[PDB]
Structure 1
Amino acid sequence: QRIRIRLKAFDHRLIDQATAEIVETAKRTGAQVRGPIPLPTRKERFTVLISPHVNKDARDQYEIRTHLRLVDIVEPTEKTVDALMRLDLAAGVDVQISL
């Protein structure tokens, strides 16, 4: 088969050390790996009133960036499966993997 792995996080340093962890766990265990590719980063904006009572035109603008990385895996061995299910990832990376 191919197994597809999506990574999303709020930081880009933390997300591509996490991809570097899973591209090098996967041909250390001996599989061709496809990627990693950066998908477009979805940025969500917010705009608040800062004053407790009036003054409409005084505002702040904030943002959350969600970075995305995609790795496809070519050669899903038995050794490859038990390697990258038991890996030491950080608290900021969300993983959702595809069969």
Structure 2
Amino acid sequence: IRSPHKYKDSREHFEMRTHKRLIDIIDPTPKTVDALMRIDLPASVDVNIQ
């Protein structure tokens, strides 16, 4: 509801998107797996290594 009191019929719509990508299945070479995690990703990017 927009108003702080008694105006039910006036409303907002907020969303929250979340993007997913890069399901890459690279070779676990022990030379690479060091350099996979050396780079600083930005603050607004999450990463899992599963």
Question: Match for 1:80 among 28, 32, 38?
Answer: 32
Equivalent pairs counted in the alignment come to 49
Gaps of 5+ in 1: 1-48
Gaps of 5+ in 2: none
* Structure with a larger share of its residues in helix: 1
Residues 45-84 of structure 1: pairs in structure 2 closer than 5 A: 49-69=1-21, 70-73=23-26, 75-84=27-36
TM-score (norm 1): 0.47
| Percent identity of paired positions between Structure 1 and Structure 2 | 59
TM-score (norm 2): 0.86
Aligned CA-pair RMSD = 0.9
2:44 matched to 1:92?
yes
* Structure with a larger share of its residues in strand: 1
Structure 1 distance, partners of 2:25, 2:48, is 12
Deviation string 1:42-74 (CA, Å, 9 cap, x unpaired) is: xxxxxxx0101011010000111000012221x
**Aligned to 1:63, what secondary structure does the other structure show?**
strand
Which structure has the greater CA radius of gyration?
A: 2
Deviation string 1:10-59 (CA, Å, 9 cap, x unpaired) is: xxxxxxxxxxxxxxxxxxxxxxxxxxxxxxxxxxxxxxx01010110100
